[PDB]
Design an enzyme around this catalytic site. Structure first.
Site, mmCIF file in Angstrom:
data_model
loop_
_atom_site.group_PDB
_atom_site.id
_atom_site.type_symbol
_atom_site.label_atom_id
_atom_site.label_comp_id
_atom_site.label_asym_id
_atom_site.label_seq_id
_atom_site.Cartn_x
_atom_site.Cartn_y
_atom_site.Cartn_z
ATOM 1 N N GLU A 105 -18.861 -30.748 98.431
ATOM 2 C CA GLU A 105 -18.624 -31.058 99.861
ATOM 3 C C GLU A 105 -17.526 -32.119 100.057
ATOM 4 O O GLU A 105 -16.684 -31.984 100.936
ATOM 5 C CB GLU A 105 -19.932 -31.512 100.523
ATOM 6 C CG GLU A 105 -20.987 -30.397 100.692
ATOM 7 C CD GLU A 105 -20.652 -29.363 101.788
ATOM 8 O OE1 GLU A 105 -19.697 -29.583 102.528
ATOM 9 O OE2 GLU A 105 -21.283 -28.280 101.838
ATOM 10 N N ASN B 179 -13.656 -28.913 111.977
ATOM 11 C CA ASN B 179 -13.959 -27.465 112.089
ATOM 12 C C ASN B 179 -13.253 -26.760 113.247
ATOM 13 O O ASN B 179 -12.760 -27.408 114.161
ATOM 14 C CB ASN B 179 -15.477 -27.268 112.166
ATOM 15 C CG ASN B 179 -16.189 -27.989 111.041
ATOM 16 O OD1 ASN B 179 -17.059 -28.819 111.257
ATOM 17 N ND2 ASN B 179 -15.786 -27.698 109.838
ATOM 18 N N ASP C 79 -14.455 -25.105 115.685
ATOM 19 C CA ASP C 79 -15.167 -25.297 116.942
ATOM 20 C C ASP C 79 -14.960 -26.674 117.571
ATOM 21 O O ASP C 79 -15.515 -26.940 118.635
ATOM 22 C CB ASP C 79 -16.658 -25.003 116.797
ATOM 23 C CG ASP C 79 -17.403 -26.047 115.947
ATOM 24 O OD1 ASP C 79 -16.800 -26.999 115.434
ATOM 25 O OD2 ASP C 79 -18.616 -25.901 115.766
ATOM 26 N N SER D 292 -15.924 -29.537 116.185
ATOM 27 C CA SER D 292 -16.799 -30.504 115.542
ATOM 28 C C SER D 292 -16.093 -31.054 114.268
ATOM 29 O O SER D 292 -15.059 -30.515 113.839
ATOM 30 C CB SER D 292 -18.154 -29.891 115.195
ATOM 31 O OG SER D 292 -17.976 -28.859 114.249
ATOM 32 N N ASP E 158 -16.979 -32.755 110.167
ATOM 33 C CA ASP E 158 -17.919 -33.071 109.088
ATOM 34 C C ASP E 158 -17.596 -34.454 108.460
ATOM 35 O O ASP E 158 -16.432 -34.786 108.254
ATOM 36 C CB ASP E 158 -17.806 -32.000 108.014
ATOM 37 C CG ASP E 158 -18.279 -30.620 108.492
ATOM 38 O OD1 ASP E 158 -18.990 -30.471 109.508
ATOM 39 O OD2 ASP E 158 -17.983 -29.651 107.774
ATOM 40 N N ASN F 137 -22.424 -32.619 110.043
ATOM 41 C CA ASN F 137 -21.614 -32.082 111.126
ATOM 42 C C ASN F 137 -21.910 -32.758 112.486
ATOM 43 O O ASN F 137 -23.060 -32.999 112.807
ATOM 44 C CB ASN F 137 -21.826 -30.568 111.195
ATOM 45 C CG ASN F 137 -20.997 -29.932 112.268
ATOM 46 O OD1 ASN F 137 -21.484 -29.713 113.362
ATOM 47 N ND2 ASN F 137 -19.739 -29.688 111.994
#
Length: 129
Positions: free
Chosen positions: A35, A46, A48, A50, A52, A59
């Site tokens: 990750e 991301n 959308d 959002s 991380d 998220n």
């Protein structure tokens, strides 16, 4: 902070992650490796809108507040920035809520794709725990 593999294993064990909801330590170290490459300061945006955050790339749509993700739920009740700290306490506590949510570690796409069903014990091999 960029953790060493065994150093992170030891910190995660101390924070109660070894066998948390049935997931051995190696699963957690593997997910962190893919990750964030063990970097607490990792961020990734991301499609959308959002983002991380941190070692386990938690998220902003569901779990933390970053002030820029419209209709975020902030389920861990934490500014997302707190997830970037060299102290992994906030990340660990939030991850415990995530993995309890019904989908276990499948919530982490790199865990599903790169750790699940592999010999995850290899990630803690040689470590003094």
């Amino acid at each position: 902070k960029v953790f060493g593999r065994c150093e992170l294993a030891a910190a995660m064990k101390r924070h109660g992650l070894d066998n948390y909801r049935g997931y051995s330590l190696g699963n957690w170290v593997c997910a962190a490796k893919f990750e964030s490459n063990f970097n607490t300061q990792a961020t990734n945006r991301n499609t959308d809108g959002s983002t991380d955050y941190g070692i386990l790339q938690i998220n902003s749509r569901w779990w933390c507040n970053d002030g820029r993700t419209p209709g975020s739920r902030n389920l861990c009740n934490i500014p997302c920035s707190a997830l970037l700290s060299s102290d992994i306490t906030a990340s660990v506590n939030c991850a415990k809520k995530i993995v309890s949510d019904g989908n276990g570690m499948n919530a982490w796409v790199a865990w599903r794709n790169r750790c699940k069903g592999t010999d995850v014990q290899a990630w803690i091999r040689g470590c003094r725990l």
